Structure formats: structure tokens, C-alpha cells
């Protein structure tokens, strides 16, 4: 059951990301990669949800499932872009440390929201397998 597997994987990636963001400038490349690895996993969640949706039979559940999975691409796209901007923003000394910290925080907030979107998707996926 890859949805449960993906949800656990997403949690492990987020636990690691929380750890990487507590660390230094040495976690720069890793942070860019972390965002990439999260983006690959979201593309898998989205893909699985579309495949499951095709085999699903109740229109309401199918619609509710389609409603939640369609926001995942947009958040994953935003993560790749905002990470590319932040990545290129590190290594510059003119910009303020508080503004830099806020970029890390914003990225964390967006990751938390992505995780919440997946959390809601998991919840709906679990319920759909009953019918």
C-alpha cells in the first residue's frame, strides 16, 4: 500500500528537514535536494491518487479525492520555485539575517502546509478504500 508508505516517507523527510533547518550553511545543498526529494514524492502521491480515482466508484468520494489532490501540484511547484530563489539568495551578505531566517521560516510553513495537504489526502484515501 504505497499511500501509507508515502505518508510515512513524507513524515521522515519532514523530520529530517526540521533537523536540516536547525543546522548551518553546510545544509544549503542538502536543503535544495530535500525540496527536490519532497517534490518527487508529491508527484508520486498525486499519481497514485489519480490511479485510485479511476478505479473508485462513488462520485462524491471521487470528487472529494480529486478536490484534494489537485492542490498538491501547486504546492509542490511553489516549493521548487521558492527553493530555487532561496538557494540562490544564500551566499549574499547585503540581505538581513532576520529576512534570511524568515525565508527559512516561510519555507518551513509551506512545507508544513504541504504536509497538511498530504495529511488530508491520506485521511480521504484511507476512507475511500472502504467503498
Amino acid at each position: 500500500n504505497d499511500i501509507i508508505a508515502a505518508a510515512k516517507r513524507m513524515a521522515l523527510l519532514m523530520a529530517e528537514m526540521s533537523r536540516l533547518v536547525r543546522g548551518g550553511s553546510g545544509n544549503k545543498r542538502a536543503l535544495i535536494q530535500c525540496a527536490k526529494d519532497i517534490a518527487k514524492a508529491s508527484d508520486e502521491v498525486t499519481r497514485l491518487a489519480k490511479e485510485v480515482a479511476k478505479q473508485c466508484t462513488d462520485k462524491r468520494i471521487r470528487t472529494n479525492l480529486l478536490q484534494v489532490c489537485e492542490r498538491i501540484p501547486t504546492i509542490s511547484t511553489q516549493l521548487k520555485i521558492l527553493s530555487t530563489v532561496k538557494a540562490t539568495m544564500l551566499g549574499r551578505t547585503n540581505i538581513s539575517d532576520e529576512e534570511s531566517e524568515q525565508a527559512t521560516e516561510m519555507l518551513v510553513h509551506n512545507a508544513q502546509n504541504l504536509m497538511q495537504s498530504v495529511k488530508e489526502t491520506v485521511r480521504e484515501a484511507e476512507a475511500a478504500s472502504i467503498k
Partner: protein
């Protein structure tokens, strides 16, 4: 396998498997279509948010309580309640559990039929029983005689039951409490300059109705002591930070229960419905309804109730008579705790309707 005890709560729908502890899910229900235009790419958003998410997300929606004075106006949303609950809350298929549904003591025809028929064909529950709500708190209260007062937003009821035969000549449905108490409270919240008037904006009020209202010893002197400067005022903090200091209206709102003269509405206080229901029951039996008066429904959780009610009844009641009011803790789950007992009663599983026999006999059997 296991039965699920499912209460169509007036508020405050309650769900939890058959006993012995508590409803796994209790929720104010609510369905809300989104009032404002969406600019989210996707859009990817629920057509209507049900509770809980519509009570985290208020306002950007238009909240509709689907059961209006106990009448399920459209079952389309009711079915969505059922489905949402069963699948994404309790996480179960209705075919698996024989179910137990509750209804009110008095509701028109065909409210229970249309429900039963749709629920059998839509959710294909294998067996069912549909109980009037007052009776389940009797099984919950474990009393063998007495008048049951079932009070939730927006319909109250007053049912007399004796060992173990019902008193039809004394069954009262009052449509009064509580959503109108909510509306009245909102009307006296305009008096403190806070106009949270829209339907959605009403929910916060319901929360101040939960938490902040109090009940006095006696009106006239609480009205007096309100004229005293002494601070009855309690400070609510609002979801935009605002601090609201309410007091007179704090004891004023529940007093409606004793006197509907505040709404005006032409029905008498619990005081009189008690007396007049007792005085629609046989003399001999009047002895034992007195001291087996049972209040219920989540709304009744105001501390000066019942001894305000007691003192009021004692004033109208005949001398030396033993009057005692039975008040459970946590009356909101009284009903649910009722239901758990019922469905557990063997052999009365074979007094539960079964889908095949329903296939054979249709709605005729229902009554």
C-alpha cells in the same frame, strides 16, 4: 460486526460504537457553501465544507444547520452528514454495522419514514431501530418513573413515562430552546454593541452561550443586584482580539426558560409545563412523578438550573409533596449512553427491523 450507536443530535450530532464509554465523534454538523469568490488555482476546494472544517473555517462560507426545529429540511445534506461521518470520521461501511438511529418524541409524518426509506436504500444498513430521543435518556437515567426534559438547540421536549408504560396524554414538544435562545442572546448582544449578526457570526455567540451564561437564585433580586455596581461582568475574548464584558444579560438569557415572556412566545415556562403535565397525569401517579423529574440535553448545563427550577416548581406545587429533580453530569452524552444500552439488549435485536423484512414490508411496519 459491532453495532454503532448513532444519534441525530439536534446540535451536536453524536456517534460512537455500542458502549461503554463515549461518542467517538460529536460535532455541530454544519454544511456551508463558500460565500466568496475563489482565486485559488485548482480550485481544489470542497463544494461545501462540512463540520469540523467549516467551524474552523467560518465566514467564507454560509453555514446551514440542516435540521431545522428538528425537521430535516433536505436529506441531501443529511446523507452527506451520514456519509462523511461514516466514512471519514468513524471510518466504516454501513452495511457492516446494524445501526440505531434516534428521532424526536413528536415529529410529523413522513419525517421518520422518508429517513428510514432513504437510509435503507442509500446506505444499505442491514438492520435498524429508530428510537424517540427522550426514551433513550430513560434507559440512560435508569429510572423507572418520571418526566424527561430533552433540551438542545433548537427544540426542547417534555415526556412523562411511568413504570414502564408511556403517558401519551402528557407528551409535550416545545420548539423553544435553544437556537432561539441563541438568537435572543444575539439580540441582547446588540445591546452591548456587538453585532455579530450574520448566520456564521452566530456560532461564536453559541460559544459564549456555552461558556459564559449563568443562572441566578431568583430573578427580581438578581435584577436588583444588577443595579448594584458589583461586577457580574465577565470578559469574553473574541477571534479578532476584542474583549466583551457581559453581566446582566449573562443571567438574563436563561430566565427565558422559566419565562418565555422575554421572547413573548405563547408557551409557558418549564415551571408550568411541569405542573400542567403533572396535572394531566393520574393522581396516584402524581405522587411518583414528583421526585422523579429528569432534565436533559446539553443546553441544561447552566448551574442555577435546576434549583431555580426546583424553587419555582416548589412554589406552584402542592404542600409537603416530595419534588426532586434528577440531573446527570454531562447531559449531552446522556442520550448516547442511552443508546448504548438499548442496542445491547438481547433478544431485542430481533425487534430491530432487518432489510430483507423491510424489503418485504416497506414503511408500513415503521409505525
Amino acid at each position: 460486526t459491532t453495532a454503532l450507536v448513532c444519534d441525530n443530535g439536534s446540535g451536536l450530532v453524536k456517534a460512537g460504537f455500542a458502549g461503554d464509554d463515549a461518542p467517538r465523534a460529536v460535532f455541530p454538523s454544519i454544511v456551508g457553501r463558500p460565500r466568496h469568490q475563489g482565486v485559488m488555482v485548482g480550485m481544489g476546494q470542497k463544494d461545501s465544507y462540512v463540520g469540523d472544517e467549516a467551524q474552523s473555517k467560518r465566514g467564507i462560507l454560509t453555514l446551514k444547520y440542516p435540521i431545522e426545529h428538528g425537521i430535516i429540511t433536505n436529506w441531501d445534506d443529511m446523507e452527506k452528514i451520514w456519509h462523511h461521518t461514516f466514512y471519514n470520521e468513524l471510518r466504516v461501511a454501513p452495511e457492516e454495522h446494524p445501526t440505531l438511529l434516534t428521532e424526536a418524541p413528536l415529529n410529523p409524518k413522513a419525517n421518520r419514514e422518508k429517513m428510514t426509506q432513504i437510509m435503507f436504500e442509500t446506505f444499505n444498513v442491514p438492520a435498524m431501530y429508530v428510537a424517540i430521543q427522550a426514551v433513550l435518556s430513560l434507559y440512560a437515567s435508569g429510572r423507572t418513573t418520571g418526566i424527561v426534559l430533552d433540551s438542545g438547540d433548537g427544540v426542547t421536549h417534555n415526556v412523562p413515562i411511568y413504570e414502564g408504560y408511556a403517558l401519551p396524554h402528557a407528551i409535550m414538544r416545545l420548539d423553544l430552546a435553544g437556537r432561539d435562545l441563541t438568537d435572543y442572546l444575539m439580540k441582547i448582544l446588540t445591546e452591548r454593541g456587538y453585532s455579530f449578526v450574520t448566520t456564521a457570526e452566530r456560532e461564536i455567540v453559541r460559544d459564549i452561550k456555552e461558556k459564559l451564561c449563568y443562572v441566578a437564585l431568583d430573578f427580581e433580586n438578581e435584577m436588583a443586584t444588577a443595579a448594584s455596581s458589583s461586577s457580574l461582568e465577565k470578559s469574553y475574548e473574541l477571534p479578532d482580539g476584542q474583549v466583551i464584558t457581559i453581566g446582566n444579560e449573562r443571567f438574563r438569557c436563561p430566565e427565558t426558560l422559566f419565562q418565555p415572556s422575554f421572547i413573548g412566545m405563547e408557551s409557558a415556562g418549564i415551571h408550568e409545563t411541569t405542573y400542567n403535565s403533572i396535572m394531566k397525569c393520574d393522581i396516584d401517579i402524581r405522587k411518583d412523578l414528583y421526585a422523579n423529574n429528569v432534565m436533559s440535553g446539553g443546553t441544561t448545563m447552566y448551574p442555577g438550573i435546576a434549583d431555580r427550577m426546583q424553587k419555582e416548581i416548589t412554589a406552584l406545587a402542592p404542600s409537603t409533596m416530595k419534588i426532586k429533580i434528577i440531573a446527570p453530569p454531562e447531559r449531552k452524552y446522556s442520550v448516547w449512553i442511552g443508546g448504548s444500552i438499548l442496542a445491547s439488549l438481547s433478544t431485542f435485536q430481533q425487534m430491530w427491523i432487518t432489510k430483507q423484512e423491510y424489503d418485504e414490508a416497506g414503511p408500513s411496519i415503521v409505525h
